[PDB]
Amino acid sequence: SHMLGLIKKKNTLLGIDISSTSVKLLELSRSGGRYKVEAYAVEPLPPNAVVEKNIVELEGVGQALSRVLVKAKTNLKSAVVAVAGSAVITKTIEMEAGLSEDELENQLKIEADQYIPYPLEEVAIDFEVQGLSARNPERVDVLLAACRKENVEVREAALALAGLTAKVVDVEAYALERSYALLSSQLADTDQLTVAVVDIGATMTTLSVLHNGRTIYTREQLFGGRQLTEEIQRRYGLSVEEAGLAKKQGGLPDDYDSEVLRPFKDAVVQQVSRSLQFFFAAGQFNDVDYIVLAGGTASIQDLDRLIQQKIGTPTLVANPFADMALNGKVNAGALASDAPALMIACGLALRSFD
Amino acid sequence: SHMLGLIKKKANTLLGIDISSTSVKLLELSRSGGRYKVEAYAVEPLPPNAVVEKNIVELEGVGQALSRVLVKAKTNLKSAVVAVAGSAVITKTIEMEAGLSEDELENQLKIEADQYIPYPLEEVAIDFEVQGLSARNPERVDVLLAACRKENVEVREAALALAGLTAKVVDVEAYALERSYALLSSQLGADTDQLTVAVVDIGATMTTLSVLHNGRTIYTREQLFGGRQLTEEIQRRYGLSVEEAGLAKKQGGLPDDYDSEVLRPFKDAVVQQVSRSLQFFFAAGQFNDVDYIVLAGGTASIQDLDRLIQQKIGTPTLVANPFADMALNGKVNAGALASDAPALMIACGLALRSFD
Ligand SMILES: Nc1ncnc2c1ncn2[C@@H]1O[C@H](COP(=O)(O)OP(=O)(O)O)[C@@H](O)[C@H]1O
Ligand SMILES: Nc1ncnc2c1ncn2[C@@H]1O[C@H](COP(=O)(O)OP(=O)(O)O)[C@@H](O)[C@H]1O
Ligand SMILES: [Mg+2]
Ligand SMILES: [Mg+2]
Ligand SMILES: [Mg+2]
Numbered sequence: 001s002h003m004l005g006l007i008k009k010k011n012t013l014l015g016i017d018i019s020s021t022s023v024k025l026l027e028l029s030r031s032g033g034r035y036k037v038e039a040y041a042v043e044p045l046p047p048n049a050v051v052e053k054n055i056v057e058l059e060g061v062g063q064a065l066s067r068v069l070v071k072a073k074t075n076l077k078s079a080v081v082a083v084a085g086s087a088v089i090t091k092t093i094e095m096e097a098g099l100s101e102d103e104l105e106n107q108l109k110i111e112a113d114q115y116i117p118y119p120l121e122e123v124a125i126d127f128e129v130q131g132l133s134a135r136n137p138e139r140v141d142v143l144l145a146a147c148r149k150e151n152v153e154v155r156e157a158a159l160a161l162a163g164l165t166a167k168v169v170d171v172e173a174y175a176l177e178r179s180y181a182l183l184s185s186q187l188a189d190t191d192q193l194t195v196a197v198v199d200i201g202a203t204m205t206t207l208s209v210l211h212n213g214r215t216i217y218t219r220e221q222l223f224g225g226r227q228l229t230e231e232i233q234r235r236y237g238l239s240v241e242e243a244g245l246a247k248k249q250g251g252l253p254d255d256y257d258s259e260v261l262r263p264f265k266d267a268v269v270q271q272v273s274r275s276l277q278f279f280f281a282a283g284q285f286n287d288v289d290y291i292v293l294a295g296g297t298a299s300i301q302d303l304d305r306l307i308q309q310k311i312g313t314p315t316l317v318a319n320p321f322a323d324m325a326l327n328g329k330v331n332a333g334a335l336a337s338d339a340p341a342l343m344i345a346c347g348l349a350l351r352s353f354d
Numbered sequence: 355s356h357m358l359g360l361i362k363k364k365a366n367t368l369l370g371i372d373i374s375s376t377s378v379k380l381l382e383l384s385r386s387g388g389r390y391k392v393e394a395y396a397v398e399p400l401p402p403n404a405v406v407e408k409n410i411v412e413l414e415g416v417g418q419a420l421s422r423v424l425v426k427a428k429t430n431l432k433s434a435v436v437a438v439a440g441s442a443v444i445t446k447t448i449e450m451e452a453g454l455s456e457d458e459l460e461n462q463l464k465i466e467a468d469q470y471i472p473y474p475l476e477e478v479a480i481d482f483e484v485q486g487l488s489a490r491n492p493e494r495v496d497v498l499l500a501a502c503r504k505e506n507v508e509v510r511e512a513a514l515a516l517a518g519l520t521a522k523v524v525d526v527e528a529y530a531l532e533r534s535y536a537l538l539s540s541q542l543g544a545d546t547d548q549l550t551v552a553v554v555d556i557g558a559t560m561t562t563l564s565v566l567h568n569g570r571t572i573y574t575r576e577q578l579f580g581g582r583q584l585t586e587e588i589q590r591r592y593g594l595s596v597e598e599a600g601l602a603k604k605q606g607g608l609p610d611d612y613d614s615e616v617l618r619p620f621k622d623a624v625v626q627q628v629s630r631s632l633q634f635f636f637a638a639g640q641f642n643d644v645d646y647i648v649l650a651g652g653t654a655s656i657q658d659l660d661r662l663i664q665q666k667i668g669t670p671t672l673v674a675n676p677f678a679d680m681a682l683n684g685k686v687n688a689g690a691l692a693s694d695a696p697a698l699m700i701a702c703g704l705a706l707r708s709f710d
Pocket of ligand 1: 019020021022200201202203204224225226229244247248294295296297298299300301337341
């Protein structure tokens with residue numbers, strides 16, 4: 001009766017991106033092929049509640065999660081969250097064919113130890129049979145992915161504090177690929193291009209090269225928009241909130257562009273340039289067809305122009321909601337201005353439709 | 355721990371297999387974000403008396419046709435979505451004990467569903483979905499059950515096995531129609547989400563009217579009239595067999611008297627067919643008009659049949675084309691697909707189930 005579809009298959013999940021400085025919620029639905037944004041909200045975190053990709057203050061995250069639900073105003077209580085790909089170990093091993101799912105699980109629990117740095121008791125294991133081994137029909141190819149149990153369990157607890165349940169623990173790299181596939185309109189078929197996605201966060205910048213939809217390269221750096229925030233704080237005597245608000249609202253003195261924003265803009269360019277060079281010297285690729293700017297920092301005025309000017313590669317700000325429709329309860333202007341920072345959240349929400 | 359998704363979920367694309375009374379249709383779709391693509395497509399006629407009405411009679415005959423439709427389609431997919439007719443499915447909402455798991459619920463549902471379903475206890479296939487807490491009593495839950503005869507599932511399951519195919523999903527044809535209809539938004543000049551459309555599927559031995567309001571089916575009527583009538587009229591008049599007459603219909607090498615004595619009278623009979631069925635639906639509810647009439651089925655490819663119906667009923671009419679906004683695989687014959695499009699609605703809808 002598992003095959004029965006006498007009842008129409010009818011199951012959406014919240015896209016919840018937990019970063020170092022904020023919590024982002026996105027809810028999607030679709031009618032045929034066209035997607036629609038049901039709900040959206042962003043909540044700042046208490047400082048040092050989430051350092052790096054690691055949750056430290058559990059209650060602080062839970063509170064942030066609780067409040068972001070209210071502003072989004074949605075009914076959904078199940079969500080998709082993600083761990084960093086840097087925290088996941090992936091390995092392809094071969095196993096005996098003809099094993100049941102339980103037998104396969106038992107063997108993989110015991111032998112995972114042999115394929116993972118982590119101690120055996122602290123590991124969350126995910127697996128997938130790929131098919132029969134090419135060499136030998138007696139064996140199957142098994143994909144194995146592991147991370148420390150702590151990473152899953154801490155996010156479990158964090159969502160629980162907001163009454164939320166993680167139906168799926170995704171990997172940020174996968175979420176990026178899903179939302180990037182929607183940029184095909186904004187770009188030619190995303191299915192035939194080589195594209196450098198530069199996610200410029202607050203404290204973290206990440207280059208992700210995608211060829212025909214699949215990630216083929218990833219590099220990270222401790223560079224981000226907080227650098228711009230801290231320089232506004234220092235020059236004008238503002239707190240983190242005031243300075244962050246000042247970026248968007250633009251109420252700063254005349255010397256802001258030349259003394260603060262442009263030097264930061266240049267640091268962004270140098271950062272992007274070095275990362276591309278690292279990628280070119282890492283494989284067959286000599287060039288990318290496009291650079292897609294992502295993260296809140298990508299909304300900096302004419303940052304895309306500057307990168308085009310200094311690098312010579314077509315650059316645009318990510319907007320996964322270009323073709324989508326909107327619920328009347330969603331602010332079109334707010335979403336549009338925050339669009340490049342919602343790539344991960346959108347990709348997490350797209351996991352509902354896989 | 356099935357929350358884990360450390361490995362990316364992928365690769366669950368299913369063949370759309372539309373089994374009718376006279377043919378088997380295969381369609382394979384892929385996706386690139388939201389944009390769909392036609393990967394594979396083939397059509398194989400069925401041996402006579404293999405499928406009468408919606409009932410499979412010659413199992414080996416359907417299996418063999420399925421084997422042959424695979425070769426022509428040239429696909430590596432071995433999993434498929436097949437459908438039963440909605441007339442074979444009963445839908446009922448019943449009230450059950452709360453706190454029971456789904457597995458717990460299914461076992462007990464065998465005993466409880468019997469009172470409400472017109473099928474034998476040991477001969478029924480039951481699908482169910484919990485809706486939520488009962489309004490009458492929050493200690494109980496409302497459960498939607500949909501049932502059909504076990505045989506309808508098993509025979510299509512066996513037919514596919516004979517061709518090395520697996521039925522991963524047994525869909526309902528009405529659901530398949532809704533999925534492919536949602537794609538007509540472009541050609542219809544309006545969003546499928548806000549529109550009222552009467553879909554007239556004119557098959558070989560059957561015509562079916564389906565009214566869709568904002569994307570959902572709110573009415574369905576069917577009759578045993580179809581393109582075989584045209585074929586049977588060609589058979590007798592010119593002394594041609596089923597194959598020759600059916601081939602002549604599309605190719606049309608026929609004698610000058612074909613248009614006035616056979617083709618046009620059939621055109622008019624179709625109009626009479628569509629006309630009555632619409633009046634049935636208007637007199638069945640608030641609706642006094644439909645915005646569009648969508649012609650589906652192979653018989654809908656009769657030239658200017660859409661214009662005739664539009665003029666004689668007064669409602670905008672077009673021939674269904676679910677592949678308008680789709681890229682095509684290089685191995686797929688663009689011309690053949692274009693001419694067979696209105697007959698591929700169900701097959702397209704079945705393949706779209708891969709993405710639900
Ligand atoms: N319109 C904007 N202009 C400039 N900077 C912005 C804008 N919107 C957001 N930011 C910056 O984006 C940074 C946060 O980026 P985001 O990717 O959304 O979170 P994270 O960096 O934690 O992943 C903050 O430093 C904020 O100052
Ligand atoms: N181009 C065409 N012109 C006229 N009739 C056609 C054309 N193509 C197919 N037909 C007729 O349409 C019928 C096929 O209907 P179809 O929907 O494919 O069958 P079913 O749904 O009953 O399996 C056949 O009787 C065929 O003669
Ligand atoms: Mg981020
Ligand atoms: Mg009964
Ligand atoms: Mg049909």
